[PDB]
mmCIF file of C-alpha atoms and ligand atoms in Angstrom:
data_model
loop_
_atom_site.group_PDB
_atom_site.id
_atom_site.type_symbol
_atom_site.label_atom_id
_atom_site.label_comp_id
_atom_site.label_asym_id
_atom_site.label_seq_id
_atom_site.Cartn_x
_atom_site.Cartn_y
_atom_site.Cartn_z
ATOM 1 C CA UNK D 18 0.014 -0.020 -0.082
ATOM 2 C CA UNK D 19 1.928 3.085 -1.438
ATOM 3 C CA UNK D 20 1.561 6.500 0.019
ATOM 4 C CA UNK D 21 1.556 8.045 -3.515
ATOM 5 C CA UNK D 22 0.094 6.796 -6.649
ATOM 6 C CA UNK D 23 2.522 4.307 -8.416
ATOM 7 C CA UNK D 24 4.802 5.957 -10.818
ATOM 8 C CA UNK D 25 4.452 4.296 -14.258
ATOM 9 C CA UNK D 26 6.997 3.284 -16.385
ATOM 10 C CA UNK D 27 7.579 4.130 -20.314
ATOM 11 C CA UNK D 28 5.797 1.745 -22.593
ATOM 12 C CA UNK D 29 7.353 -0.562 -25.463
ATOM 13 C CA UNK D 30 5.767 -0.670 -28.745
ATOM 14 C CA UNK D 31 6.070 -3.895 -30.524
ATOM 15 C CA UNK D 32 7.167 -3.598 -34.045
ATOM 16 C CA UNK D 33 6.002 -6.664 -35.609
ATOM 17 C CA UNK D 34 8.021 -8.934 -37.827
ATOM 18 C CA UNK D 35 9.346 -8.937 -41.434
ATOM 19 C CA UNK D 36 7.895 -11.265 -43.715
ATOM 20 C CA UNK D 37 10.190 -13.644 -45.563
ATOM 21 C CA UNK D 38 13.360 -12.601 -43.616
ATOM 22 C CA UNK D 39 15.429 -14.438 -41.009
ATOM 23 C CA UNK D 40 17.368 -13.490 -38.061
ATOM 24 C CA UNK D 41 20.669 -15.116 -37.601
ATOM 25 C CA UNK D 42 23.509 -14.793 -34.876
ATOM 26 C CA UNK D 43 21.223 -15.880 -31.951
ATOM 27 C CA UNK D 44 23.726 -18.792 -31.507
ATOM 28 C CA UNK D 45 27.280 -19.259 -32.836
ATOM 29 C CA UNK D 46 25.644 -21.916 -35.006
ATOM 30 C CA UNK D 47 22.224 -20.318 -36.414
ATOM 31 C CA UNK D 48 22.087 -21.138 -40.093
ATOM 32 C CA UNK D 49 20.102 -22.414 -42.864
ATOM 33 C CA UNK D 50 21.050 -25.224 -45.293
ATOM 34 C CA UNK D 51 19.741 -24.378 -48.730
ATOM 35 C CA UNK D 52 19.681 -26.521 -51.982
ATOM 36 C CA UNK D 53 21.446 -25.464 -54.964
ATOM 37 C CA UNK D 54 19.703 -27.285 -57.969
ATOM 38 C CA UNK D 55 19.884 -25.166 -61.313
ATOM 39 C CA UNK D 56 23.020 -23.323 -60.480
ATOM 40 C CA UNK D 57 25.987 -24.297 -62.302
ATOM 41 C CA UNK D 58 28.681 -22.384 -60.348
ATOM 42 C CA UNK D 59 31.858 -23.901 -61.861
ATOM 43 C CA UNK D 60 32.658 -20.981 -64.248
ATOM 44 C CA UNK D 61 30.404 -18.286 -62.557
ATOM 45 C CA UNK D 62 29.140 -17.497 -59.077
ATOM 46 C CA UNK D 63 26.658 -14.417 -58.675
ATOM 47 C CA UNK D 64 25.040 -13.843 -55.321
ATOM 48 C CA UNK D 65 22.923 -11.106 -54.518
ATOM 49 C CA UNK D 66 21.120 -10.761 -51.068
ATOM 50 C CA UNK D 67 19.938 -7.949 -48.826
ATOM 51 C CA UNK D 68 21.336 -7.571 -45.152
ATOM 52 C CA UNK D 69 20.776 -5.360 -42.137
ATOM 53 C CA UNK D 70 23.083 -5.605 -38.857
ATOM 54 C CA UNK D 71 24.812 -3.809 -36.124
ATOM 55 C CA UNK D 72 27.359 -6.456 -35.810
ATOM 56 C CA UNK D 73 31.209 -6.221 -36.522
ATOM 57 C CA UNK D 74 31.891 -9.993 -37.530
ATOM 58 C CA UNK D 75 30.168 -13.024 -38.863
ATOM 59 C CA UNK D 76 29.655 -15.562 -41.705
ATOM 60 C CA UNK D 77 27.190 -14.715 -44.233
ATOM 61 C CA UNK D 78 27.277 -17.591 -46.771
ATOM 62 C CA UNK D 79 29.557 -20.540 -47.554
ATOM 63 C CA UNK D 80 29.827 -23.414 -50.211
ATOM 64 C CA UNK D 81 32.535 -26.090 -50.559
ATOM 65 C CA UNK D 82 33.690 -29.245 -52.114
ATOM 66 C CA UNK D 83 33.221 -32.285 -49.758
ATOM 67 C CA UNK D 84 37.042 -32.166 -49.309
ATOM 68 C CA UNK D 85 37.067 -28.579 -49.006
ATOM 69 C CA UNK D 86 39.753 -27.917 -51.530
ATOM 70 C CA UNK D 87 37.361 -25.743 -53.237
ATOM 71 C CA UNK D 88 35.141 -23.118 -51.616
ATOM 72 C CA UNK D 89 33.578 -19.553 -51.869
ATOM 73 C CA UNK D 90 32.615 -17.443 -48.776
ATOM 74 C CA UNK D 91 31.208 -13.951 -47.707
ATOM 75 C CA UNK D 92 32.422 -12.936 -44.287
ATOM 76 C CA UNK D 93 32.120 -9.600 -42.170
ATOM 77 C CA UNK D 94 35.197 -8.266 -40.220
ATOM 78 C CA UNK D 95 35.514 -5.211 -38.383
ATOM 79 C CA UNK D 96 32.293 -4.077 -40.053
ATOM 80 C CA UNK D 97 33.269 -4.587 -43.586
ATOM 81 C CA UNK D 98 32.650 -7.305 -46.173
ATOM 82 C CA UNK D 99 35.428 -9.782 -47.494
ATOM 83 C CA UNK D 100 34.612 -12.243 -50.602
ATOM 84 C CA UNK D 101 37.077 -14.955 -51.314
ATOM 85 C CA UNK D 102 37.142 -18.245 -53.122
ATOM 86 C CA UNK D 103 39.789 -21.047 -54.123
ATOM 87 C CA UNK D 104 39.246 -22.916 -57.430
ATOM 88 C CA UNK D 105 41.624 -25.632 -56.213
ATOM 89 C CA UNK D 106 45.083 -24.101 -56.678
ATOM 90 C CA UNK D 107 45.051 -20.831 -55.059
ATOM 91 C CA UNK D 108 42.882 -18.060 -53.305
ATOM 92 C CA UNK D 109 41.233 -14.999 -54.924
ATOM 93 C CA UNK D 110 40.149 -12.522 -52.319
ATOM 94 C CA UNK D 111 38.136 -9.069 -52.711
ATOM 95 C CA UNK D 112 37.307 -6.544 -50.044
ATOM 96 C CA UNK D 113 34.817 -3.571 -50.153
ATOM 97 C CA UNK D 114 35.166 -0.195 -47.951
ATOM 98 C CA UNK D 115 31.555 0.217 -47.297
ATOM 99 C CA UNK D 116 30.726 0.143 -43.630
ATOM 100 C CA UNK D 117 27.691 -2.077 -43.205
ATOM 101 C CA UNK D 118 26.944 -2.120 -39.323
ATOM 102 C CA UNK D 119 24.511 0.995 -39.496
ATOM 103 C CA UNK D 120 21.426 -1.090 -38.938
ATOM 104 C CA UNK D 121 19.931 0.024 -42.321
ATOM 105 C CA UNK D 122 19.187 -2.329 -45.085
ATOM 106 C CA UNK D 123 21.861 -2.810 -47.805
ATOM 107 C CA UNK D 124 21.961 -4.974 -51.043
ATOM 108 C CA UNK D 125 25.127 -6.937 -51.402
ATOM 109 C CA UNK D 126 26.421 -8.875 -54.608
ATOM 110 C CA UNK D 127 29.362 -11.011 -54.951
ATOM 111 C CA UNK D 128 30.767 -12.036 -58.248
ATOM 112 C CA UNK D 129 33.301 -14.582 -59.778
ATOM 113 C CA UNK D 130 33.011 -14.683 -63.539
ATOM 114 C CA UNK D 131 35.307 -15.911 -66.005
ATOM 115 C CA UNK D 132 38.810 -14.899 -64.697
ATOM 116 C CA UNK D 133 37.809 -11.968 -62.616
ATOM 117 C CA UNK D 134 36.020 -11.330 -59.333
ATOM 118 C CA UNK D 135 34.432 -8.188 -57.793
ATOM 119 C CA UNK D 136 31.811 -6.933 -55.135
ATOM 120 C CA UNK D 137 28.966 -4.593 -55.048
ATOM 121 C CA UNK D 138 27.289 -2.889 -52.090
ATOM 122 C CA UNK D 139 24.182 -0.436 -52.646
ATOM 123 C CA UNK D 140 25.223 -0.286 -56.302
ATOM 124 C CA UNK D 141 28.691 1.046 -55.522
ATOM 125 C CA UNK D 142 31.039 -1.625 -57.309
ATOM 126 C CA UNK D 143 34.511 -2.272 -56.522
ATOM 127 C CA UNK D 144 37.532 -2.752 -58.936
ATOM 128 C CA UNK D 145 37.901 -6.369 -60.161
ATOM 129 C CA UNK D 146 40.537 -8.758 -58.996
ATOM 130 C CA UNK D 147 42.259 -11.305 -61.296
ATOM 131 C CA UNK D 148 41.489 -14.897 -60.248
ATOM 132 C CA UNK D 149 44.432 -16.414 -58.824
ATOM 133 C CA UNK D 150 45.832 -19.957 -59.774
ATOM 134 C CA UNK D 151 45.718 -22.269 -62.554
ATOM 135 C CA UNK D 152 42.702 -24.155 -61.757
ATOM 136 C CA UNK D 153 39.455 -23.077 -63.843
ATOM 137 C CA UNK D 154 36.491 -24.359 -61.891
ATOM 138 C CA UNK D 155 34.749 -23.673 -58.584
ATOM 139 C CA UNK D 156 33.725 -27.462 -57.611
ATOM 140 C CA UNK D 157 31.485 -27.540 -54.576
ATOM 141 C CA UNK D 158 28.510 -29.417 -53.139
ATOM 142 C CA UNK D 159 25.196 -28.636 -54.253
ATOM 143 C CA UNK D 160 24.541 -26.954 -50.957
ATOM 144 C CA UNK D 161 24.779 -23.306 -49.664
ATOM 145 C CA UNK D 162 25.097 -22.471 -45.878
ATOM 146 C CA UNK D 163 23.416 -19.195 -45.061
ATOM 147 C CA UNK D 164 24.119 -17.082 -41.944
ATOM 148 C CA UNK D 165 26.386 -19.590 -40.289
ATOM 149 C CA UNK D 166 27.398 -23.249 -40.275
ATOM 150 C CA UNK D 167 26.337 -26.497 -38.515
ATOM 151 C CA UNK D 168 27.747 -27.086 -34.988
ATOM 152 C CA UNK D 169 29.228 -30.287 -36.378
ATOM 153 C CA UNK D 170 31.139 -28.663 -39.392
ATOM 154 C CA UNK D 171 34.946 -27.697 -39.279
ATOM 155 C CA UNK D 172 35.352 -25.159 -41.859
ATOM 156 C CA UNK D 173 39.061 -25.206 -43.125
ATOM 157 C CA UNK D 174 41.053 -22.265 -44.672
ATOM 158 C CA UNK D 175 38.632 -19.411 -44.286
ATOM 159 C CA UNK D 176 40.035 -18.096 -41.016
ATOM 160 C CA UNK D 177 38.462 -17.604 -37.630
ATOM 161 C CA UNK D 178 35.210 -15.754 -38.640
ATOM 162 C CA UNK D 179 33.134 -19.089 -38.898
ATOM 163 C CA UNK D 180 30.503 -18.011 -36.094
ATOM 164 C CA UNK D 181 26.954 -16.893 -37.301
ATOM 165 C CA UNK D 182 26.416 -13.472 -38.165
ATOM 166 C CA UNK D 183 24.117 -11.525 -35.866
ATOM 167 C CA UNK D 184 21.826 -9.931 -38.640
ATOM 168 C CA UNK D 185 18.667 -10.142 -40.460
ATOM 169 C CA UNK D 186 18.838 -11.582 -44.299
ATOM 170 C CA UNK D 187 16.098 -11.102 -46.857
ATOM 171 C CA UNK D 188 15.818 -13.028 -50.172
ATOM 172 C CA UNK D 189 18.797 -14.377 -51.887
ATOM 173 C CA UNK D 190 19.578 -15.139 -55.523
ATOM 174 C CA UNK D 191 22.469 -17.252 -57.008
ATOM 175 C CA UNK D 192 23.039 -17.033 -60.771
ATOM 176 C CA UNK D 193 19.886 -15.262 -61.295
ATOM 177 C CA UNK D 194 17.609 -17.613 -59.435
ATOM 178 C CA UNK D 195 15.908 -16.750 -56.162
ATOM 179 C CA UNK D 196 16.436 -19.491 -53.610
ATOM 180 C CA UNK D 197 13.287 -20.827 -51.590
ATOM 181 C CA UNK D 198 14.318 -19.833 -47.984
ATOM 182 C CA UNK D 199 11.216 -21.288 -46.791
ATOM 183 C CA UNK D 200 12.455 -24.956 -47.867
ATOM 184 C CA UNK D 201 15.707 -25.387 -46.323
ATOM 185 C CA UNK D 202 17.399 -28.916 -46.080
ATOM 186 C CA UNK D 203 18.122 -28.339 -42.385
ATOM 187 C CA UNK D 204 18.485 -25.486 -39.983
ATOM 188 C CA UNK D 205 19.378 -24.614 -36.595
ATOM 189 C CA UNK D 206 18.485 -21.767 -34.224
ATOM 190 C CA UNK D 207 16.897 -19.157 -36.616
ATOM 191 C CA UNK D 208 14.346 -16.827 -35.880
ATOM 192 C CA UNK D 209 12.123 -13.751 -37.193
ATOM 193 C CA UNK D 210 13.451 -10.133 -37.470
ATOM 194 C CA UNK D 211 11.598 -7.047 -35.846
ATOM 195 C CA UNK D 212 10.434 -4.464 -38.554
ATOM 196 C CA UNK D 213 12.478 -2.071 -36.578
ATOM 197 C CA UNK D 214 15.593 -2.986 -34.420
ATOM 198 C CA UNK D 215 18.312 -1.252 -32.506
ATOM 199 C CA UNK D 216 21.570 -2.651 -31.255
ATOM 200 C CA UNK D 217 21.326 -4.910 -28.396
ATOM 201 C CA UNK D 218 19.961 -8.321 -26.970
ATOM 202 C CA UNK D 219 16.426 -8.777 -26.026
ATOM 203 C CA UNK D 220 15.354 -10.256 -22.734
ATOM 204 C CA UNK D 221 11.711 -11.278 -22.574
ATOM 205 C CA UNK D 222 11.486 -11.611 -18.719
ATOM 206 C CA UNK D 223 11.160 -15.420 -18.716
ATOM 207 C CA UNK D 224 14.721 -16.777 -18.173
ATOM 208 C CA UNK D 225 18.555 -15.944 -18.476
ATOM 209 C CA UNK D 226 21.550 -16.561 -20.610
ATOM 210 C CA UNK D 227 24.405 -18.505 -18.747
ATOM 211 C CA UNK D 228 28.279 -18.033 -20.048
ATOM 212 C CA UNK D 229 31.652 -19.416 -19.268
ATOM 213 C CA UNK D 230 30.878 -22.919 -18.505
ATOM 214 C CA UNK D 231 34.574 -23.678 -17.377
ATOM 215 C CA UNK D 232 33.965 -21.009 -14.682
ATOM 216 C CA UNK D 233 35.000 -17.366 -13.915
ATOM 217 C CA UNK D 234 37.280 -16.036 -11.325
ATOM 218 C CA UNK D 235 36.445 -12.736 -9.865
ATOM 219 C CA UNK D 236 39.189 -12.691 -7.476
ATOM 220 C CA UNK D 237 40.419 -9.171 -6.360
ATOM 221 C CA UNK D 238 39.904 -6.667 -9.145
ATOM 222 C CA UNK D 239 37.226 -6.730 -11.846
ATOM 223 C CA UNK D 240 35.440 -4.053 -13.896
ATOM 224 C CA UNK D 241 31.764 -4.707 -15.169
ATOM 225 C CA UNK D 242 30.241 -2.077 -17.877
ATOM 226 C CA UNK D 243 27.073 -2.311 -19.843
ATOM 227 C CA UNK D 244 24.331 -0.469 -21.276
ATOM 228 C CA UNK D 245 20.694 -1.298 -20.386
ATOM 229 C CA UNK D 246 17.020 -0.356 -21.320
ATOM 230 C CA UNK D 247 13.859 -1.344 -19.739
ATOM 231 C CA UNK D 248 10.378 -0.459 -18.960
ATOM 232 C CA UNK D 249 10.076 -2.687 -15.918
ATOM 233 C CA UNK D 250 11.190 -1.706 -12.128
ATOM 234 C CA UNK D 251 12.791 -5.136 -11.174
ATOM 235 C CA UNK D 252 15.260 -7.349 -12.880
ATOM 236 C CA UNK D 253 18.490 -9.165 -12.395
ATOM 237 C CA UNK D 254 21.180 -8.211 -14.483
ATOM 238 C CA UNK D 255 24.516 -10.288 -13.704
ATOM 239 C CA UNK D 256 25.362 -12.765 -11.082
ATOM 240 C CA UNK D 257 28.627 -14.838 -10.414
ATOM 241 C CA UNK D 258 28.471 -17.208 -7.391
ATOM 242 C CA UNK D 259 30.291 -20.145 -5.983
ATOM 243 C CA UNK D 260 27.981 -22.802 -4.217
ATOM 244 C CA UNK D 261 29.218 -21.462 -1.148
ATOM 245 C CA UNK D 262 29.618 -17.989 0.243
ATOM 246 C CA UNK D 263 31.935 -15.831 -2.279
ATOM 247 C CA UNK D 264 29.963 -14.083 -5.043
ATOM 248 C CA UNK D 265 28.966 -10.821 -6.775
ATOM 249 C CA UNK D 266 25.711 -9.618 -8.088
ATOM 250 C CA UNK D 267 24.144 -6.715 -10.070
ATOM 251 C CA UNK D 268 20.266 -6.145 -10.023
ATOM 252 C CA UNK D 269 17.366 -3.845 -10.383
ATOM 253 C CA UNK D 270 15.113 -3.662 -7.312
ATOM 254 C CA UNK D 271 12.063 -1.157 -7.000
ATOM 255 C CA UNK D 272 14.035 1.193 -9.602
ATOM 256 C CA UNK D 273 17.239 1.193 -7.943
ATOM 257 C CA UNK D 274 20.580 -0.343 -9.005
ATOM 258 C CA UNK D 275 22.231 -2.729 -6.514
ATOM 259 C CA UNK D 276 25.779 -3.855 -6.638
ATOM 260 C CA UNK D 277 26.650 -6.912 -4.118
ATOM 261 C CA UNK D 278 29.896 -8.372 -3.317
ATOM 262 C CA UNK D 279 30.809 -11.054 -0.714
ATOM 263 C CA UNK D 280 34.609 -11.781 -0.209
ATOM 264 C CA UNK D 281 33.876 -14.253 2.506
ATOM 265 C CA UNK D 282 33.124 -12.098 5.377
ATOM 266 C CA UNK D 283 29.704 -10.846 4.540
ATOM 267 C CA UNK D 284 27.815 -8.856 1.884
ATOM 268 C CA UNK D 285 28.812 -5.554 1.001
ATOM 269 C CA UNK D 286 26.271 -3.309 -0.830
ATOM 270 C CA UNK D 287 26.415 -0.174 -3.116
ATOM 271 C CA UNK D 288 23.191 1.260 -3.789
ATOM 272 C CA UNK D 289 22.187 3.797 -6.545
ATOM 273 C CA UNK D 290 18.733 5.630 -6.439
ATOM 274 C CA UNK D 291 17.781 8.248 -8.874
ATOM 275 C CA UNK D 292 15.951 11.196 -8.293
ATOM 276 C CA UNK D 293 12.657 9.809 -9.780
ATOM 277 C CA UNK D 294 11.424 6.271 -8.998
ATOM 278 C CA UNK D 295 10.815 5.640 -12.829
ATOM 279 C CA UNK D 296 13.774 7.096 -13.904
ATOM 280 C CA UNK D 297 15.475 4.039 -15.142
ATOM 281 C CA UNK D 298 12.612 2.352 -16.598
ATOM 282 C CA UNK D 299 11.966 5.035 -19.155
ATOM 283 C CA UNK D 300 12.727 2.934 -22.048
ATOM 284 C CA UNK D 301 16.053 4.958 -22.887
ATOM 285 C CA UNK D 302 19.705 3.698 -22.599
ATOM 286 C CA UNK D 303 21.616 4.036 -19.330
ATOM 287 C CA UNK D 304 25.423 3.253 -18.879
ATOM 288 C CA UNK D 305 26.397 1.174 -15.816
ATOM 289 C CA UNK D 306 29.911 0.761 -14.382
ATOM 290 C CA UNK D 307 30.437 -1.513 -11.369
ATOM 291 C CA UNK D 308 34.332 -1.633 -10.155
ATOM 292 C CA UNK D 309 35.711 -4.175 -7.730
ATOM 293 C CA UNK D 310 39.026 -3.671 -6.297
ATOM 294 C CA UNK D 311 40.875 -4.722 -3.123
ATOM 295 C CA UNK D 312 38.984 -2.972 -0.461
ATOM 296 C CA UNK D 313 36.511 -1.095 -2.599
ATOM 297 C CA UNK D 314 33.385 -1.381 -4.533
ATOM 298 C CA UNK D 315 32.245 1.500 -6.915
ATOM 299 C CA UNK D 316 28.947 1.530 -8.770
ATOM 300 C CA UNK D 317 28.325 4.232 -11.345
ATOM 301 C CA UNK D 318 25.127 4.790 -13.286
ATOM 302 C CA UNK D 319 24.815 7.568 -15.857
ATOM 303 C CA UNK D 320 28.155 8.958 -14.503
ATOM 304 C CA UNK D 321 26.605 9.066 -10.777
ATOM 305 C CA UNK D 322 29.015 7.207 -8.559
ATOM 306 C CA UNK D 323 28.298 5.343 -5.117
ATOM 307 C CA UNK D 324 30.869 3.519 -3.318
ATOM 308 C CA UNK D 325 31.669 1.343 -0.017
ATOM 309 C CA UNK D 326 35.111 0.339 1.529
ATOM 310 C CA UNK D 327 38.464 -7.867 5.710
ATOM 311 C CA UNK D 328 39.083 -10.315 2.910
ATOM 312 C CA UNK D 329 39.450 -9.101 -0.430
ATOM 313 C CA UNK D 330 39.251 -11.879 -2.981
ATOM 314 C CA UNK D 331 35.835 -13.098 -4.233
ATOM 315 C CA UNK D 332 36.910 -16.531 -4.950
ATOM 316 C CA UNK D 333 34.392 -17.767 -7.552
ATOM 317 C CA UNK D 334 34.845 -20.231 -10.035
ATOM 318 C CA UNK D 335 31.592 -20.526 -11.874
ATOM 319 C CA UNK D 336 29.458 -19.499 -14.772
ATOM 320 C CA UNK D 337 28.259 -15.888 -15.440
ATOM 321 C CA UNK D 338 24.330 -15.753 -15.250
ATOM 322 C CA UNK D 339 23.006 -12.798 -17.223
ATOM 323 C CA UNK D 340 19.366 -11.433 -17.114
ATOM 324 C CA UNK D 341 18.363 -13.993 -14.352
ATOM 325 C CA UNK D 342 18.939 -17.375 -13.051
ATOM 326 C CA UNK D 343 17.000 -20.967 -12.514
ATOM 327 C CA UNK D 344 15.799 -21.960 -9.018
ATOM 328 C CA UNK D 345 18.468 -24.658 -8.655
ATOM 329 C CA UNK D 346 21.489 -22.277 -9.100
ATOM 330 C CA UNK D 347 22.756 -20.336 -6.045
ATOM 331 C CA UNK D 348 23.341 -16.903 -6.089
ATOM 332 C CA UNK D 349 24.703 -15.721 -2.941
ATOM 333 C CA UNK D 350 25.122 -12.156 -3.974
ATOM 334 C CA UNK D 351 21.593 -11.450 -5.520
ATOM 335 C CA UNK D 352 18.525 -10.730 -3.425
ATOM 336 C CA UNK D 353 16.122 -10.888 -6.393
ATOM 337 C CA UNK D 354 14.993 -13.676 -8.449
ATOM 338 C CA UNK D 355 12.964 -11.780 -10.970
ATOM 339 C CA UNK D 356 14.258 -12.245 -14.688
ATOM 340 C CA UNK D 357 15.180 -8.999 -16.570
ATOM 341 C CA UNK D 358 12.892 -7.629 -19.332
ATOM 342 C CA UNK D 359 14.512 -5.130 -21.929
ATOM 343 C CA UNK D 360 17.808 -5.044 -23.853
ATOM 344 C CA UNK D 361 21.480 -4.899 -22.812
ATOM 345 C CA UNK D 362 24.398 -3.941 -24.871
ATOM 346 C CA UNK D 363 28.193 -3.392 -24.690
ATOM 347 C CA UNK D 364 28.662 -6.081 -21.866
ATOM 348 C CA UNK D 365 32.412 -5.959 -21.093
ATOM 349 C CA UNK D 366 34.431 -7.312 -18.222
ATOM 350 C CA UNK D 367 37.901 -5.496 -17.273
ATOM 351 C CA UNK D 368 42.556 -5.457 -20.116
ATOM 352 C CA UNK D 369 39.170 -5.482 -21.449
ATOM 353 C CA UNK D 370 37.015 -8.320 -22.500
ATOM 354 C CA UNK D 371 33.236 -8.284 -24.044
ATOM 355 C CA UNK D 372 30.882 -10.966 -23.485
ATOM 356 C CA UNK D 373 29.009 -12.304 -26.559
ATOM 357 C CA UNK D 374 25.838 -13.473 -25.482
ATOM 358 C CA UNK D 375 25.538 -15.806 -28.663
ATOM 359 C CA UNK D 376 28.013 -17.975 -26.991
ATOM 360 C CA UNK D 377 25.883 -18.869 -24.091
ATOM 361 C CA UNK D 378 25.782 -22.750 -23.259
ATOM 362 C CA UNK D 379 22.418 -22.356 -21.654
ATOM 363 C CA UNK D 380 19.992 -19.697 -23.032
ATOM 364 C CA UNK D 381 16.055 -19.354 -22.183
ATOM 365 C CA UNK D 382 14.025 -16.371 -23.130
ATOM 366 C CA UNK D 383 16.782 -14.359 -24.262
ATOM 367 C CA UNK D 384 17.685 -13.327 -27.951
ATOM 368 C CA UNK D 385 21.348 -12.241 -28.504
ATOM 369 C CA UNK D 386 21.783 -9.278 -30.790
ATOM 370 C CA UNK D 387 18.121 -8.884 -31.687
ATOM 371 C CA UNK D 388 16.489 -5.799 -29.856
ATOM 372 C CA UNK D 389 13.027 -4.708 -30.853
ATOM 373 C CA UNK D 390 11.848 -0.971 -31.518
ATOM 374 C CA UNK D 391 13.780 2.218 -32.709
ATOM 375 C CA UNK D 392 16.488 3.941 -30.719
HETATM 376 CL CL1 LIG F 419 41.176 -14.440 0.918
HETATM 377 MG MG1 LIG F 420 38.241 -26.509 -58.998
HETATM 378 MG MG1 LIG F 421 37.212 -16.489 -0.380
#
């Protein structure tokens, strides 16, 4: 029974979904395996597709011989496109300057024809490159992998960018023919695209994402930074806990942000309370910094800091739970059990390390890299 009428939070407007489009990158192996029947790519491979993304890296498409001696692939790296193939006796590579990670739709074309190869993005064609090697044919299996690769597949000689691209892909054509993406040979972890999206990972409020199955050790010093947006007053953000006492936690309870830490001598808590109760559930992005050092704990929200200052090591050796946690998992430094609802972006631990939610080993009600609504 509150003394004043409750302060309502902002409201989220569902954008709906794009018809005939697929969102990849939800897991490191999200993909579609599409049949190639009428295409003869031996002397010519022209692929045209539309893409929308905020990501910096990922595999967009791949085709290869059973022995992998012949192949062709399109990958994104540092926000830019790279097209390469090997006809059996040498690799040819083409790059394009266009920056694609702006969240807007782009048309892309990759072309290998005769003894030349080139790329086109939004109509801007790159200079041609001469096919390398003596071989004259691209000999590959009658199958194209779109948006990523199967978990059991081991792609050779295409570098380390073999994870699924966090992006929405529309229709795709090969040598003038539109492929029926609705009739894939097989697939894994694919979903729909929001009509309008913004950079981030959506948490529907029902589950969580668990990372680092081998265990993470907080120890003495650790810096956690992230950005979040939400229209709810309660929600767990992050927790790393031993099955005993040592643990750390970050959560939103009744409009306030709490950073708990326990080095084996009791819970230490830094609390941030905004001027307005509904300030943080306004649907806009907020920055969050939580630094743990020897005998110091500092929580900073939107530039506002709050700290608290005899064991000093948080001896954890467990997974990192994001956005919530299941009942059978102990979280000694979290008072709440409520799953977060909203989006989180730029999650990093510091010597910096950013956490990629698409790598979660256990995921429930969370959609990495896919966040609805405009920014
Ligand atoms: Cl100790
Ligand atoms: Mg060949
Ligand atoms: Mg200890």
